[PDB]
Scaffold this motif. Sequence first.
Motif, PDB file in Angstrom:
ATOM      1  N   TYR A  79       0.794  -1.230   0.000  1.00 32.89           N
ATOM      2  CA  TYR A  79       0.000   0.000   0.000  1.00 32.89           C
ATOM      3  C   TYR A  79       0.822   1.275   0.000  1.00 32.89           C
ATOM      4  O   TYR A  79       0.285   2.366  -0.255  1.00 32.89           O
ATOM      5  N   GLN A 106      -2.207   2.954  -4.881  1.00 33.68           N
ATOM      6  CA  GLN A 106      -3.256   3.905  -4.517  1.00 33.68           C
ATOM      7  C   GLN A 106      -4.016   4.341  -5.790  1.00 33.68           C
ATOM      8  O   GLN A 106      -5.249   4.396  -5.802  1.00 33.68           O
ATOM      9  N   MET A 133      -6.627   1.705  -7.077  1.00 35.66           N
ATOM     10  CA  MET A 133      -7.898   1.829  -6.372  1.00 35.66           C
ATOM     11  C   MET A 133      -8.626   3.144  -6.744  1.00 35.66           C
ATOM     12  O   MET A 133      -9.853   3.145  -6.956  1.00 35.66           O
ATOM     13  N   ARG A 156     -15.972   2.535  -7.866  1.00 37.56           N
ATOM     14  CA  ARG A 156     -15.628   2.576  -6.439  1.00 37.56           C
ATOM     15  C   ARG A 156     -15.546   4.008  -5.952  1.00 37.56           C
ATOM     16  O   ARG A 156     -16.238   4.391  -5.027  1.00 37.56           O
ATOM     17  N   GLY A 168      -7.494   4.007   7.394  1.00 29.98           N
ATOM     18  CA  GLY A 168      -6.654   3.617   6.257  1.00 29.98           C
ATOM     19  C   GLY A 168      -6.847   4.598   5.114  1.00 29.98           C
ATOM     20  O   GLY A 168      -7.376   4.226   4.053  1.00 29.98           O
ATOM     21  N   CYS A 169      -6.453   5.858   5.329  1.00 30.44           N
ATOM     22  CA  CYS A 169      -6.791   6.930   4.358  1.00 30.44           C
ATOM     23  C   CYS A 169      -6.083   6.831   3.010  1.00 30.44           C
ATOM     24  O   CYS A 169      -6.514   7.445   2.052  1.00 30.44           O
ATOM     25  N   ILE A 177      -7.957  10.339  -0.242  1.00 27.33           N
ATOM     26  CA  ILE A 177      -9.136  10.564  -1.096  1.00 27.33           C
ATOM     27  C   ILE A 177     -10.483  10.640  -0.344  1.00 27.33           C
ATOM     28  O   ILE A 177     -11.231  11.606  -0.538  1.00 27.33           O
ATOM     29  N   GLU A 221      -3.353   6.230   8.798  1.00 23.99           N
ATOM     30  CA  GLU A 221      -2.742   5.392   7.750  1.00 23.99           C
ATOM     31  C   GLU A 221      -1.418   4.828   8.249  1.00 23.99           C
ATOM     32  O   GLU A 221      -0.562   5.587   8.713  1.00 23.99           O
ATOM     33  N   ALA A 222      -1.244   3.524   8.118  1.00 25.28           N
ATOM     34  CA  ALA A 222      -0.110   2.819   8.744  1.00 25.28           C
ATOM     35  C   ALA A 222       1.021   2.613   7.755  1.00 25.28           C
ATOM     36  O   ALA A 222       2.156   2.354   8.160  1.00 25.28           O
ATOM     37  N   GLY A 271       0.175   5.654  11.442  1.00 27.39           N
ATOM     38  CA  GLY A 271       0.159   4.503  12.342  1.00 27.39           C
ATOM     39  C   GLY A 271      -1.055   3.599  12.151  1.00 27.39           C
ATOM     40  O   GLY A 271      -1.935   3.881  11.324  1.00 27.39           O
ATOM     41  N   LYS A 272      -1.083   2.492  12.899  1.00 24.79           N
ATOM     42  CA  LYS A 272      -2.204   1.558  12.828  1.00 24.79           C
ATOM     43  C   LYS A 272      -3.355   2.110  13.641  1.00 24.79           C
ATOM     44  O   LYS A 272      -3.140   2.743  14.683  1.00 24.79           O
ATOM     45  N   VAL A 273      -4.588   1.942  13.155  1.00 23.80           N
ATOM     46  CA  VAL A 273      -5.743   2.455  13.893  1.00 23.80           C
ATOM     47  C   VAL A 273      -5.873   1.803  15.285  1.00 23.80           C
ATOM     48  O   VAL A 273      -6.526   2.352  16.172  1.00 23.80           O
ATOM     49  N   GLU A 274      -5.277   0.624  15.430  1.00 21.31           N
ATOM     50  CA  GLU A 274      -5.255  -0.119  16.695  1.00 21.31           C
ATOM     51  C   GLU A 274      -4.229   0.448  17.680  1.00 21.31           C
ATOM     52  O   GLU A 274      -4.275   0.111  18.867  1.00 21.31           O
ATOM     53  N   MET A 298      -8.961  -6.319   7.129  1.00 22.38           N
ATOM     54  CA  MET A 298      -9.083  -4.912   7.456  1.00 22.38           C
ATOM     55  C   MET A 298     -10.478  -4.575   7.991  1.00 22.38           C
ATOM     56  O   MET A 298     -10.649  -3.589   8.694  1.00 22.38           O
ATOM     57  N   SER A 318     -10.099  -4.064  11.551  1.00 23.73           N
ATOM     58  CA  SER A 318      -9.534  -2.738  11.908  1.00 23.73           C
ATOM     59  C   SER A 318     -10.646  -1.681  11.903  1.00 23.73           C
ATOM     60  O   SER A 318     -10.724  -0.797  12.774  1.00 23.73           O
TER      61      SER A 318
END
Lengths: 344, 344
Positions: free
Chosen positions: B20, B26, B29, B35, B59-60, B64, B81-82, B107-110, B135, B138
Motif C-alpha cells: 500500500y 493507490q 484503487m 468505487r 486507512g486513508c 481521497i 494510515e499505517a 500509524g495503525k488504527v489499533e 481490514m 480494523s
Amino acid sequence: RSVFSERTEESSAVQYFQFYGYLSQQQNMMQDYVRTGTYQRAILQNHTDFKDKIVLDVGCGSGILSFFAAQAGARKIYAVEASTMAQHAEVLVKSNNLTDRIVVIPGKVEEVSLPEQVDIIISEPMGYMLFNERMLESYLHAKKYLKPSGNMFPTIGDVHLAPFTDEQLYMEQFTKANFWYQPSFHGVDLSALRGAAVDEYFRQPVVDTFDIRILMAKSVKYTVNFLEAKEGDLHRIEIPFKFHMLHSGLVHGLAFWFDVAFIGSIMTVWLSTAPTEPLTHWYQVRCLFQSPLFAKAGDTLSGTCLLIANKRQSYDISIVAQVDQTGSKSSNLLDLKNPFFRYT
Amino acid sequence: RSVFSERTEESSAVQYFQFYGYLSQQQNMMQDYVRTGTYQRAILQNHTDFKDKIVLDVGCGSGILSFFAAQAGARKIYAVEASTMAQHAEVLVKSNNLTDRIVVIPGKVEEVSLPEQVDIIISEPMGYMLFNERMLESYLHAKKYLKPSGNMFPTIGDVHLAPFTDEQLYMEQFTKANFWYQPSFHGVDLSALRGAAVDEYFRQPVVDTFDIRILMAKSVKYTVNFLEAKEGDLHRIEIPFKFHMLHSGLVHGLAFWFDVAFIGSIMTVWLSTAPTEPLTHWYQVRCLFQSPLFAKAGDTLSGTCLLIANKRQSYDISIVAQVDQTGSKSSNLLDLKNPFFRYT
Ligand SMILES: CNC[C@@H](O)COc1ccc(Cl)c(-c2nc(-c3c(C)noc3C)c(C)c(N3CC4(CCN(C(=O)OC)CC4)C3)n2)c1
Ligand SMILES: CNC[C@@H](O)COc1ccc(Cl)c(-c2nc(-c3c(C)noc3C)c(C)c(N3CC4(CCN(C(=O)OC)CC4)C3)n2)c1
Ligand SMILES: Nc1ncnc2c1ncn2[C@@H]1O[C@H](CSCC[C@H](N)C(=O)O)[C@@H](O)[C@H]1O
Ligand SMILES: Nc1ncnc2c1ncn2[C@@H]1O[C@H](CSCC[C@H](N)C(=O)O)[C@@H](O)[C@H]1O
C-alpha cells in the motif's frame, strides 16, 4: 544465529521461502527448457565429474538437479533445501527409488550439517539480473563443504551491461505518473505527488525482454568466479564502464543480462540469458535513467554501476554515467528487490 | 503489543504495508471509477451526515475519502494510515489547503491515539471476496472512537455466493496441476506429487470476472452489519447454504461477490461488485472444487462455507457441499491469501 540470519531480515526470508514452497514456482523453473535442459546436458556430458562422486545440491527445490547428478552416476548427493519444498523432494527421492543415493537435508545451507565433504557443488542460485536473491552468497558459503580441488557447477558467472535507447519505454513512465497531474480528480488536486510518482517508477528495474536493436554499444562484462570468490566479494559490486558508442541517439539507461559456464573435465557448457539467445524465465533487466543522455557514435559513455547488498536479499543499485565529450551526466538509484515485472 | 500485532504475523504486516505504500497501488484503487465515484456520491449526497461533524478515515491511503468528507463540510477529519503513504497524504492535504480540517495520523488504527470521539467513521476496508486483508476488523476496532449513535460508511456488507459451472476454468487449473503427473520429466518420475499438486492449485481462489450464464442457482446472502458487529465476530464466519438448482450440470465450485451499503440520513447508496454490475477492480472470486458435483435442475445443493481468520491477514476457507438427492459430497480447503489472479 547464522551467516544467513545475520545477513537477512526475517520478514524477507519468510516471504522468500514461502515463494519457493509452491510447487507452481518449482514448476515455473523446471518448465524453462533452456535452463533445465542445459543443466541436464552440462551434468550428463561431464559424467566423469559425477561418476561415483559425492555431490552437494545447494537449494534443491524439487530435487531436479540432484536427479541429474544421479543419472550421471553420483554415489551420494546431499540435497539441501530451506523451504517446505524439502518434504516434496523427499517424496520424489523415495518414489524414484533413490533413498540410498540422494539424502534430502531440510534447512539453510548456512545452518545444516553435512556428514562428509563433497567432490562437486551444483546449484541454480541465479536471480534476475544475476544478483537478485543473494543466493550466490549461499552457493559460495557452501564451499566450506568442498574438498580441496573440488568443482562447482556452474563454475563462473558473467553479467553483461550495455547502454540502450528506447524512447517508448522512457515516455511510458511519465504517462503513468501523469495520473497525478490532475488539478481536480473528483475535486482533489493530485499534482503535488507527480514528482514522487515519477521517482517511484524510475526506481524499479524493468524485467522484460527487448529487441537487440535498442543496444547502442558492445557490452561490458563483470565476472564472478565461483571457485575463487568469497561471500564478502558480493557485498559491494563495482562495475566500471567505458562504452564506445556504436550509434548516435538518446541513451535511456543500461540493459543487463548474464551467462553462466559449467567448466567440466570433458567440456564447458554455457547457459545464456542474453537477448541474442532464446528467451528464458530470467528475461533481461533494464535500468532507466530519469535523465537521458545524448551521445553520438564514437562518443564514450563512462561511469560506474555500483550494487550494494541489503538485508532484503537483494541490492541497492546506483548507476552514474556521463558522456565524456560533453560532460552531461546522469545519476540513478534503483531498488532491485522491487522491480517492474513488465513481461506480465 | 497491540490488538493488531497480536493477530498478525510480522512477515505478513511488512509485505502488506509495503504493497500500500506504492503510489501505483493507490492509483489502482483511485482509478476504479465505480468505487471512487460511488464513495463520493454516498458522502456528498449524505452531506448532513458530515456537515460540521468529526470524522475518522480508517486507512486513508492518498487521503481521497477524507477529501470527500471535507467537501461535504466536515469540521475535522482524522485520517489514519499505517503505510508510508501517510507522508504522501500529508503532502496533498497541504497542497489542497486543508491543513485546518484534515489531520493525518500515521500509524495503525489499533495503535494511534485520537484527540476525541467521532461522529462517523469512513473506510474502504474491503478485500477481494470482501474478507481478504482482515481490514474489516480494523474498521470494527475503530468503533472505540465512535460516539454513541455514530454512523459507519459503509454501514453493512453483503457477501453473495452461488454455484457455477465452468469446465474451461476447471481444466485450466487441472492441466497446470498435471505437470506433476509426468512419470518421466527429463527421465524423472514426478507422479507421486500429483495429489499435492492438485491440492495446491485448487487451494487458490480464482480472482477474475465471468459471464452470469455460468451461475446455476440464485445466490445465498450473508450480511455483516458494521454498526453492530464486534471485531471478534469476524474470527469465525459460518455461512450455511442450501441452493435450489436452476440448471443441470457439473458444479465446479462457488462464486463470490459482495455489495456494501452506505446508509445515511438522506439516502442509502449501494456499491456493488456483482457480476450483473459494471466491473470493478475487485472482479469476482471463485473457489473451485477439485472433485466437481453433478446436479439436476430442481436438486438442492447444501453445505457450509466456513472462514477461519489466520495470522496472515486472511482466512482459511472450508467449503463442504453436497447434492442432497444423491449424497454426492465435495470438501475443499482454500488459502484466501494466495489466489490465482486470473484477470492478468
Ligand atoms: C535461485 N534463483 C532461482 C531462479 O530460477 C529464479 O529465476 C527468476 C527469474 C525471473 C524472475 Cl522475475 C524471478 C522472480 N524472482 C522473485 C523474487 C525472488 C525469488 N526473490 O525476490 C524476488 C522479487 C519474484 C518475486 C518473482 N516473481 C513475482 C512474480 C511476478 C509478478 N507476479 C504476478 O504478476 O502475478 C500476478 C507474481 C509472480 C514472479 N520472480 C526469478
Ligand atoms: C482495503 N482493501 C482495499 C481494496 O481496494 C483492495 O481491493 C483489491 C481488489 C482486488 C485485488 Cl486482486 C486486490 C489485491 N489484494 C492483494 C492482497 C492484499 C491487499 N493483501 O493480500 C493480498 C493477496 C494483492 C496482493 C493484490 N495484487 C497482487 C497483484 C497481482 C496482479 N498485478 C499485476 O498483474 O500487475 C501488477 C498487480 C499486483 C494485485 N491485489 C485488492
Ligand atoms: N540459503 C539457502 N539454503 C537452502 N536452500 C535455499 C537457500 N536459498 C535458497 N534456497 C532454495 O534454493 C532453491 C532455488 S530455485 C532452484 C531449485 C532447483 N535446484 C532447480 O534448479 O530447479 C529454492 O527452492 C530455495 O528455497
Ligand atoms: N490497521 C490499519 N491501520 C491503518 N491503516 C491501515 C490498516 N490496515 C490497512 N490500512 C491502510 O488502509 C488502506 C486501504 S486501501 C484504501 C485507501 C483509501 N481510503 C481509498 O479508499 O482510496 C491502505 O492504505 C492500508 O495501508
